[PDB]
Each structure stands twice: as structure tokens, then as C-alpha cells.
UniProtKB/Swiss-Prot annotation:
Effect of D295H: Complete loss of RdRp activity
Compartment annotation: Host cytoplasm; Host endoplasmic reticulum membrane
Amino acids binding Mg(2+) 2: D196, D294, D295
Name listed for the protein in its UniProt record: RNA-directed RNA polymerase
Membrane topology note: Single-pass type IV membrane protein
CC cofactor: Mg(2+)
Top-level taxon in the UniProt lineage: Viruses
Subunit structure: Homooligomer. Interacts with non-structural protein 5A. Interacts with host VAPB. Interacts with host PRK2/PKN2. Interacts with host HNRNPA1 and SEPT6; these interactions facilitate the viral replication. Part of the replication complex composed of NS2, NS3, NS4A, NS4B, NS5A and the RNA-directed RNA polymerase embedded in an ER-derived membranous web.
Reactions listed under catalytic activity: RNA(n) + a ribonucleoside 5'-triphosphate = RNA(n+1) + diphosphate
Function: RNA-dependent RNA polymerase that performs primer-template recognition and RNA synthesis during viral replication. Initiates RNA transcription/replication at a flavin adenine dinucleotide (FAD), resulting in a 5'- FAD cap on viral RNAs. In this way, recognition of viral 5' RNA by host pattern recognition receptors can be bypassed, thereby evading activation of antiviral pathways.
Cofactor binding description: Binds 2 magnesium ion that constitute a dinuclear catalytic metal center.
Modified residues (Phosphoserine): S21
């Protein structure tokens, strides 16, 4: 089958650079291809094991109300006169239509379902050119609430129990490091590698979705749930029409929709299944996986330099047969720090006592680029704040990000003003003054004492600043002392930010 099709209809809209609709042409050519898929007894065996595990799972329907209350606030309004606000506040219009969409889902297991197609507002930095915008594919809100009724309890319960510790989304960054480090130190001669699929969504075939759905039906589910999950699978997950923002038939989809509820769960599942099958084809020794969508880490016992190199090609051929080839091929590492997945890697520093502490970090290019963008521009995600939060132990987050921004707020008296900020698919109203508790909850107090960072990490950050035009770290130690003292002068809450978030600056 063909991954996508176009009718010719133009997807219309609704240094540092945001991606635009104008780039969507190429993105389109890149994600359209025919899918070759051929499965073996390795794929099957894995599947059977996931099903066994899915059979120990009972899931329940969410009521309309529950699904309504777990619709996110700033999600797209519906083609039927109601906001997501209206959904959240249980408006009779939202609820009534929702019920009819649900009745419609039970009564009809066939008619495809309209999905509105669009381009994403993703910011990026430059390479050595312009990466285009990814295209997001979602159905009407009324349908997205129904999706939650039928599958919310499944997607938030099943994956963890089917994939155990390999399920990446269960982990905070510290927990993720904890798992990756333990895995590593459990191999006599560890070898690991990141894998990632060349536009994964488009590689997800119809069969993968039918397989996925069949993993879902392995759960103990309400009769109505089963029906809506069959029906949603048939009328939405396997495919359906596209339609740009000006209501024009853009063509059709025959692969994963990016903007549905089963996307994160499905990709992780489907990815995990193929990767496990592929481990067994490559004959990798004592293997261990970590899967967040299509981003994958495998840690295993090394079989030798050449043996490992070879087996990774065999691992890739196998993945390819299952329709999932890599963007760039996988490369073996014998050094944990060198593995980048989820755009991030494990690295080391030292806490107050002088104990080694592992923590997650990443190339700071994009975070800085977005933080730049968002300095001259009000933003609904505020990725700068999200990054400070997630990567709070990181040298680059503490010295550049935290520093610059508490300077801007200080100067602009906005140290009490809440900001919307999206992390872990949730949208928080975050008050800057609250960061200490957050970081303490998320990484513990050691995140304010991290020092003596690995020399590789220090270099990468330094390199990165000189590349983007941003002052060296010497400046940021000076500037920080003058943001910290300013705050202590302010007492109470503000002084707590200075005590904790900038304690690294006192000589
Ligand atoms: C010196 N000035 C005339 C010219 C600076 N330009 C080239 C600018 C582009 O702006 C940027 C673009 C992409 C990445 C970084 C920067 C940048 C940042 C970001 C750092 C992280 C917080 C958000 C701003 C800067 C912060 C401070 C400074 C500074 O001049 O001290 C510069 C920063 N830049 C570089
Ligand atoms: Mn990918
Ligand atoms: Mn990926």
C-alpha cells in the first residue's frame, strides 16, 4: 500500500527559524512511499508475548464527563460550534454531540472519518539546511473525546505492563538515566546504540494497526469499548481523508495519524515489537530495550568489534523487512555518554559530597534557539521554561537558560506572572517563583549542587555558545552573581530562587 496520497490541494495555515506551511511540499514528498513488510517467527513470537501480557489487563470506559475533563484546554475547537473550554465545562452542546459521535461509532464500523491536516509551528536551528515542517493529522474534537472514552484507560495502563521497563514514557529524566545506567553496568562488555526510523508515522502500515488493535482487544474490556475500538481502528486509525484548514480535500492517509490518541502508545508498541523481533534476528546477546515512540536504545553484551558492527547491519535489515528502516544507520557505542536518543544522553557530574551523579542532558543548540525565539516573542509552550525544568541539572540550563531569563524577569518586574508551559503533553500555569520545589521534586536537591562536569559536556556547551553568537560561560558566571545578589536583596520567595538556582555562582 501507499503511505499517503495527494489530490494536489495545498495544506493551508491557521540562525533561528520556525517552520512554515511553505515547507510542507517537501515534507509531503519525503513521507510518501510504498510500504514493504514481511514478518517472521521472531515477529510472531514477540507479538504472542505482548498479547499474553495484555491479557492480564482490565480496562474500563471513561464516561463522557471524564473524557471531557481530560481534554486539554488549548486543543483545537470543533466543526460544530463548541470550544475545548465548552467540552471541559460540560456544555450541553459539547456533551450532546459527543454522545451522538459515540452512538455513531457503535452503530457504524466502516465509514472513514474526516481528519483535518496542517503544518506544525516548530522552531529549528541551522545545520551543516532547512528542515521542513512536520504535518499533524487530527479528527474533529468530538471524535477525540470519544477516543478517550474508549481508550484512555488502555493507553495509560497497557503499555507499561506489556513493555515493562522498556516503556520510556513512565520515567522522569532521573529515572530514565537510572534505568540506562543500571542496564549499562549490568553487561560485562556493554555495547549500545540509538535507532530511529526515517519518518516513522509513514512506515506504520495497516497491518501494524490491526496488530495493535488486536493487542488492545486482548484486554478485559467493556462490550461497548470493544466495539468503539474496532470501529475507531477501521474508520480512523488505519486511514481516512485529509482536509486543509480552508476545508479542501487534501487527499488521503493510509498510515499512522500523528494527531490521534493511540499515536504515542501505538508507535511505542509497534516500535518495541519490531525492535525485539529484530534483536532476535541479529542474535544480540542479553539485550535490553528502551522505547519512546520510534526513538530506541538497545544495550547488550558486545560480541567483539567486528561482530557487533555486523550484527547491527543484521538488526537493521530485519527492521527494514518489518517496514522500519533507519534515517541514519545505527552505530555501535562502547561509551554510554555517546548514545543520543530522544535528542538526549546520559552524562556525569558530582554532588556536594563528591559522589558521582548521573543525569540526562542534550545538545543545547535547539533549546537555546527556541529560547532565543521566545525572547522576542510571547509563546504558548514557552519551551525555554520547559527546558529549564526537564534539564535543570544541566550545566547549560543552569548557566545560560536560568541566568538569562531570571535576568529578563527581574528587569521587567514580571517575577510573579504565571506562564503557560507544556511538558509531558500537559499544559501547566507555571509561576517562576515555584521552580525550586519543582526541581527538588523532579531531580532532588542534588540538582543545585552539581559541579565538576565531564570535560566532553563542558566542551559541547562552550562550542555551542560560540557557534550561535552567545557569550562564553565566563560572562554567565559574572552576570549570574548580579542576578543572584539582586534576588537575595528581595527576600522571602525571590531570595529562595537566588539561594538555590544560582548557588553555583558564589566563589
Ligand atoms: C551581541 N548582539 C549584538 C548579537 C547577539 N545575537 C547574535 C544573538 C542571536 O540570538 C540568539 C539566537 C540563537 C541562539 C542564541 C541567541 C542568543 C542568546 C540566547 C541565549 C539563551 C537565552 C535566550 C537568548 C543570547 C543571549 C545573550 C546574548 C548577549 O549578547 O549577551 C546573545 C545571545 N544570542 C545571540
Ligand atoms: Mn523518526
Ligand atoms: Mn523519533
Amino acid at each position: 500500500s501507499m503511505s499517503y496520497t495527494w489530490t494536489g490541494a495545498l495544506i493551508t495555515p491557521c540562525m533561528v527559524y520556525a517552520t512554515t506551511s511553505r515547507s510542507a511540499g517537501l515534507r509531503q514528498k519525503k513521507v510518501t512511499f510504498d510500504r514493504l513488510q514481511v514478518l517472521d517467527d521472531h515477529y510472531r513470537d514477540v507479538l504472542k508475548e505482548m498479547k499474553a501480557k495484555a491479557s492480564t489487563v482490565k480496562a474500563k470506559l471513561l464516561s463522557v464527563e471524564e473524557a471531557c475533563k481530560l481534554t486539554p484546554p488549548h486543543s483545537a475547537k470543533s466543526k460544530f460550534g463548541y470550544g475545548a473550554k465548552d467540552v471541559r465545562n460540560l456544555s450541553s452542546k459539547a456533551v450532546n454531540h459527543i454522545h451522538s459521535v459515540w452512538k455513531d461509532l457503535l452503530e457504524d464500523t466502516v465509514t472513514p472519518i474526516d481528519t483535518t491536516i496542517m503544518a506544525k509551528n516548530e522552531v529549528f536551528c541551522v545545520q551543516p539546511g532547512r528542515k521542513p515542517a512536520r504535518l499533524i493529522v487530527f479528527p474533529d474534537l468530538g471524535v477525540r473525546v470519544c477516543e478517550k472514552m474508549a481508550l484512555y484507560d488502555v493507553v495509560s495502563t497497557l503499555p507499561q505492563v506489556v513493555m515493562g521497563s522498556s516503556y520510556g514514557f513512565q520515567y522522569s529524566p532521573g529515572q530514565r538515566v537510572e534505568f540506562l545506567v543500571n542496564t549499562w553496568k549490568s553487561k560485562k562488555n556493554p555495547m549500545g546504540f540509538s535507532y530511529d526510523t526515517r519518518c516513522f508515522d509513514s512506515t506504520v502500515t495497516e497491518n501494524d494497526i490491526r496488530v495493535e488493535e488486536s493487542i488492545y482487544q486482548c484486554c478485559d474490556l467493556a462490550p461497548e469499548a470493544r466495539q468503539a475500538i474496532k470501529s475507531l481502528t477501521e474508520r480512523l486509525y488505519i486511514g481516512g481523508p485529509l482536509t486543509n484548514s480552508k476545508g479542501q480535500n487534501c487527499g488521503y492517509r493510509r498510515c499512522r495519524a500523528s494527531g490521534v490518541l493511540t499515536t504515542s502508545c501505538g508507535n511505542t508498541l509497534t516500535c518495541y515489537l519490531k525492535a525485539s523481533a529484530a534483536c532476535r534476528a541479529a542474535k544480540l546477546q542479553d539485550c535490553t530495550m528502551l522505547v519512546n515512540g520510534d526513538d530506541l536504545v538497545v544495550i547488550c553484551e558486545s560480541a567483539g568489534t567486528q561482530e557487533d558492527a555486523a550484527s547491527l547491519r543484521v538488526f537493521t535489515e530485519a527492521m527494514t523487512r518489518y517496514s522500519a528502516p533507519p534515517g541514519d544507520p545505527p552505530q555501535p557505542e562502547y561509551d554510554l555518554e555517546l548514545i543520543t536518543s530522544c535528542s538526549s544522553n546520559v552524562s556525569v557530574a558530582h554532588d556536594a559530597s563528591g559522589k558521582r551523579v548521573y543525569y540526562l542532558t542534550r545538545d543545547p543548540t535547539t533549546p537555546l534557539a527556541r529560547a532565543a525565539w521566545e525572547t522576542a516573542r510571547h509563546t504558548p509552550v514557552n519551551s525555554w521554561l520547559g527546558n529549564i525544568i526537564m534539564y535543570a541539572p544541566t550545566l547549560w540550563a543552569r548557566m545560560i537558560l536560568m541566568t538569562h531569563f531570571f535576568s529578563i524577569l527581574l528587569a521587567q518586574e514580571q517575577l510573579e506572572k504565571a506562564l503557560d508551559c507544556q511538558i509531558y503533553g500537559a499544559c501547566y500555569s507555571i509561576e517562576p517563583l515555584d521552580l525550586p520545589q519543582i526541581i527538588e521534586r523532579l531531580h532532588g536537591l542534588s540538582a543545585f549542587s552539581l559541579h565538576s562536569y565531564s570535560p566532553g559536556e563542558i566542551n559541547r556547551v562552550a562550542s555551542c555558545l560560540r557557534k550561535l553568537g552567545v557569550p562564553p560561560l565566563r560572562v554567565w558566571r559574572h552576570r549570574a552573581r548580579s542576578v543572584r545578589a539582586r534576588l537575595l536583596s528581595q527576600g522571602g520567595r525571590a531570595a529562595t530562587c537566588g539561594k538555590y538556582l544560582f548557588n553555583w555562582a558564589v566563589k
